[PDB]
């Protein structure tokens, strides 16, 4: 099956909304959700970083299942930056779509993407679903 | 009674077709109609042929939606707004499930770009935005 890939940074109200939408897509299409979080994996990647990531993924998959979809955790430590990691993973598993959270920001004489969201949306070779 | 799928289309194009096909599939799965939108400002700068082309694009787009087995409606927006604000406000007004929009992906010089309308729709929207290449 071609999964829904959902990228989560941390546990947050936004992440929950992202996961709920991803679960709905998966339920409708009859495919599992692969929940991903990316770390580089060098000397800079600390114990607590990995702890938090594992907790986030465990929580995320529980949300997917509660919303009536099948979910799997995929921690990625592949020596890549997160956007490239997410995009490459999505291609590797032949994802139907990537689901990501975006910060809802009002304009301040300028209106900008976070570097991670920007690069996921633009570099992906799959549909990208952006949730606030 | 229903929360529609909103699809923003610029012109008749291969990209627009892919956008519409994805939107139709979302609509078929959810059992909701597709509202196809195109935005113009509507002052003296907006010429008659601009409006004609936009109406033709919407008519074409709805035919694609129906061919893909979904219910579609045309919604031309001439409301004195910039396209991104217009699309985002429309989606809120109709309580859309999601906005589906096309992304330009590459510039003539191979730069990774959204396209100015899609970029601002993605950032400004309150609704989920589905980005199709
Ligand atoms: Cl998030
Ligand atoms: Cl279901
Ligand atoms: Cl388009
Ligand atoms: Cl129809
Ligand atoms: Cl851009
Ligand atoms: Cl553009």
Author numbering:
A (entry chain B): 3 to 134
B (entry chain A): 2 to 134
Original authors' sentences:
Universal stress proteins (USP) are widely spread proteins in nature.
In all other known USP structures, the residues found between strands β4 and β5 region form a loop. In contrast, the apo-AF0826 and AF1760-AMP structures were determined to contain chloride ions, which are not located in the same place as the divalent ions, while AF1760 still contains the ligand molecule.
